[PDB]
Amino acid sequence: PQITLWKRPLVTIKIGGQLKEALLDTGADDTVIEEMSLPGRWKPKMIGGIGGFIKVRQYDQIIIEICGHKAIGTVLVGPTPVNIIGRNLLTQIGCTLNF
Amino acid sequence: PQITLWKRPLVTIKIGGQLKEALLDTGADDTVIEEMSLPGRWKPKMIGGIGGFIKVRQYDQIIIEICGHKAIGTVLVGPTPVNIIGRNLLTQIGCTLNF
Numbered sequence: 001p002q003i004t005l006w007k008r009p010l011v012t013i014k015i016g017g018q019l020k021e022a023l024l025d026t027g028a029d030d031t032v033i034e035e036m037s038l039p040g041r042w043k044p045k046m047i048g049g050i051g052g053f054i055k056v057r058q059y060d061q062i063i064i065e066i067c068g069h070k071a072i073g074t075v076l077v078g079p080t081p082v083n084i085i086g087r088n089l090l091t092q093i094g095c096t097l098n099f
Numbered sequence: 100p101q102i103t104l105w106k107r108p109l110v111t112i113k114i115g116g117q118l119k120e121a122l123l124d125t126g127a128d129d130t131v132i133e134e135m136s137l138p139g140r141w142k143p144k145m146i147g148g149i150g151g152f153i154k155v156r157q158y159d160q161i162i163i164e165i166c167g168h169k170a171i172g173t174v175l176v177g178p179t180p181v182n183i184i185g186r187n188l189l190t191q192i193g194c195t196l197n198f
């Protein structure tokens with residue numbers, strides 16, 4: 001698909017047996033999701049955005065589905081104001097910027 | 100161009116006759132640049148991101164070139180960690196997400 005940028009590029013994702021709305025964010029290095037349970041081991045991490053840093057839990061090797069496209073990667077879980085799909089997963093679905 | 104996301108989508112921009120590096124950011128509604136001098140009057144604005152908010156100065160109708168593509172629009176100036184080209188200008192240069 002081709003997604004325009006007149007409004008926020010929000011998509012439905014499937015993660016940890018849940019459906020969530022998330023933002024396709026080329027400015028995010030990492031994928032960051034609001035509080036939820038994920039299986040497996042995790043370690044703490046600090047990530048910095050515009051307003052400073054937040055503490056998140058880092059889960060590795062998590063399968064996500066974005067627009068029928070399956071991918072696997074690290075997912076950070078914490079107090080993000082919006083669920084964000086970052087470059088670590090955008091690359092896996094073959095997402096590019098075009099102009 | 101077609102830009103992949105294996106690395107940050109950093110491009111050269113020109114604003115006020117000066118070259119700067121900035122991130123093409125589909126997750127940013129607005130364009131935010133680090134402290135610099137711009138002409139005219141400014142209006143107040145708050146930008147909320149991960150970690151909280153920053154207060155910025157809103158300048159309207161500013162000439163800005165992005166990777167050689169000319170745009171004229173709103174530029175926010177403030178204590179952002181990185182120069183960000185948001186959707187307001189990505190639409191002016193005809194940028195889309197594709198997969």
Ligand SMILES: CC(C)[C@H]1Cc2cc(F)ccc2S(=O)(=O)N(C[C@@H](O)[C@H](Cc2ccccc2)NC(=O)NC(C)(C)C)C1
Pocket residue numbers: 023025026027028029030031032047048049050051082084086124125126127128129130131146147148149180181183185
């Ligand atoms: C709608 C919200 C999502 C957006 C809110 C937002 C809205 C705007 F109008 C302008 C900027 C921003 S932002 O910069 O706060 N940001 C865009 C993101 O792409 C940032 C850009 C960035 C990169 C590096 C340092 C500072 C900012 N990345 C970002 O937040 N990355 C992590 C991994 C922390 C999620 C989130």
Ligand SMILES: [Cl-]
Pocket residue numbers: 072073074088089
């Ligand atoms: Cl990853």
Ligand SMILES: [Cl-]
Pocket residue numbers: 094103
């Ligand atoms: Cl590729």
Ligand SMILES: [Cl-]
Pocket residue numbers: 171172173187188
């Ligand atoms: Cl604008």
